[PDB]
Amino acid sequence: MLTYGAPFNFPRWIDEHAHLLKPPVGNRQVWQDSDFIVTVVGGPNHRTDYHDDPLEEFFYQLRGNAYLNLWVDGRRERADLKEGDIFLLPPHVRHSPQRPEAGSACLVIERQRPAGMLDGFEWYCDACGHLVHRVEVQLKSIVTDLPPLFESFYASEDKRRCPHCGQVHPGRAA
Amino acid sequence: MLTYGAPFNFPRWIDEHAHLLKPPVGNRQVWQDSDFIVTVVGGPNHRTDYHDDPLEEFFYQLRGNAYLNLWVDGRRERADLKEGDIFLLPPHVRHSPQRPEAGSACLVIERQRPAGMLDGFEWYCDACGHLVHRVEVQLKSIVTDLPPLFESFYASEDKRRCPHCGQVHPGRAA
Numbered sequence: 001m002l003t004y005g006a007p008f009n010f011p012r013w014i015d016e017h018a019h020l021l022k023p024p025v026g027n028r029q030v031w032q033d034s035d036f037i038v039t040v041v042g043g044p045n046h047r048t049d050y051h052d053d054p055l056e057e058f059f060y061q062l063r064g065n066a067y068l069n070l071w072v073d074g075r076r077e078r079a080d081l082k083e084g085d086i087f088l089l090p091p092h093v094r095h096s097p098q099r100p101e102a103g104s105a106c107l108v109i110e111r112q113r114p115a116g117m118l119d120g121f122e123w124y125c126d127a128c129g130h131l132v133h134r135v136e137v138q139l140k141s142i143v144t145d146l147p148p149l150f151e152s153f154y155a156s157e158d159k160r161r162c163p164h165c166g167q168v169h170p171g172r173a174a
Numbered sequence: 175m176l177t178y179g180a181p182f183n184f185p186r187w188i189d190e191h192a193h194l195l196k197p198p199v200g201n202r203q204v205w206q207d208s209d210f211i212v213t214v215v216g217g218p219n220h221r222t223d224y225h226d227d228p229l230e231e232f233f234y235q236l237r238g239n240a241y242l243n244l245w246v247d248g249r250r251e252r253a254d255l256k257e258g259d260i261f262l263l264p265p266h267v268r269h270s271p272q273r274p275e276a277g278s279a280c281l282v283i284e285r286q287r288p289a290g291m292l293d294g295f296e297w298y299c300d301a302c303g304h305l306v307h308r309v310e311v312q313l314k315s316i317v318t319d320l321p322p323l324f325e326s327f328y329a330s331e332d333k334r335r336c337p338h339c340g341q342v343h344p345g346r347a348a
């Protein structure tokens with residue numbers, strides 16, 4: 001059977017879910033309990049965490065523009081997602097997506113992670129660039145598994161303290 | 175490093191590869207040697223084989239219209255991919271994509287299959303509906319692993335012969 005339902009018009013779906021593609025929610029997963037995790041992410045949203053995904057991430061910036069702050073070869077780099085761009089991110093490339101525009105929409109496709117394959121979330125020192133804190137998580141549900149992780153970092157000067165230079169990371173906004 | 179390169183404009187890429195999105199080639203994979211197999215499929219193309227994919231298939235019909243002939247719950251059914259539609263096909267749902275329109279373009283995303291996880295290709299009797307022939311294949315490369323499979327079916331009245339009613343399947347065109 002068609003477990004995931006029939007085909008349906010994507011622009012219409014995006015328009016119908018526009019109220020969820022903005023703060024405070026910001027994103028909406030298309031199908032539940034599927035192997036391919038298909039999400040539409042809107043904006044505005046800025047963030048300071050880097051994601052270490054053990055599998056690939058596919059991006060197709062449908063409306064508006066965004067960018068990914070990356071670590072590439074030990075250096076801070078930026079990959080721009082201009083409207084119309086597609087991009088495939090290799091496993092483990094650290095990325096912090098920034099989505100400054102309201103009304104923007106990006107198709108992001110990932111795979112469910114197998115048991116034992118963990119995701120990392122990391123923060124780096126604005127002053128010296130050293131890793132400040134890393135949490136590894138078995139990501140089963142984004143909604144329940146992820147926000148408390150972020151909240152616990154923001155609430156803790158210990159977690160936010162750079163082990164190299166001692167500077168306390170700002171937390172939620174940089 | 176960005177193994178798969180930087181982001182790039184998708185409509186421009188599709189326009190630049192338009193000569194490959196029509197007979198005799200018909201499709202073009204976007205990135206090589208990636209876990210996510212990302213393809214753009216054009217037209218026109220009609221076919222008689224059903225695919226039994228052990229993993230999910232994601233579709234986004236970007237330009238023009240297409241449709242999938244399916245077996246759902248023991249009955250012949252059709253899922254239309256109208257321009258703008260997205261669709262997620264569950265594993266093992268038999269599907270025969272038909273792409274009647276020139277200039278059409280559909281984003282199709284699949285995963286590389288692990289060793290031991292095989293794809294099936296099947297043909298069914300137009301008269302009685304019984305399975306006529308099935309081949310299982312470890313799909314490593316579409317270009318080399320798949321066309322000879324199809325050719326060997328078309329060239330063989332034995333393979334094309336229905337075991338229930340004896341009718342010889344037409345082969346390439348129905």
Ligand SMILES: O=C(O)c1ccccn1
Nearest residue numbers: 051053057095096097108
């Ligand atoms: O939710 C994710 O997995 C993700 C996607 C893009 C950038 C950072 N994180």
Ligand SMILES: O=C(O)c1ccccn1
Nearest residue numbers: 225227231269270271282
């Ligand atoms: O190439 C495939 O895996 C495929 C895709 C869609 C329909 C039939 N086959």
Ligand SMILES: [Fe+2]
Nearest residue numbers: 051053057095
């Ligand atoms: Fe990510």
Ligand SMILES: [Fe+2]
Nearest residue numbers: 125128162165
């Ligand atoms: Fe520091």
Ligand SMILES: [Fe+2]
Nearest residue numbers: 225227231269
């Ligand atoms: Fe298929």
Ligand SMILES: [Fe+2]
Nearest residue numbers: 299302336339
């Ligand atoms: Fe038959």
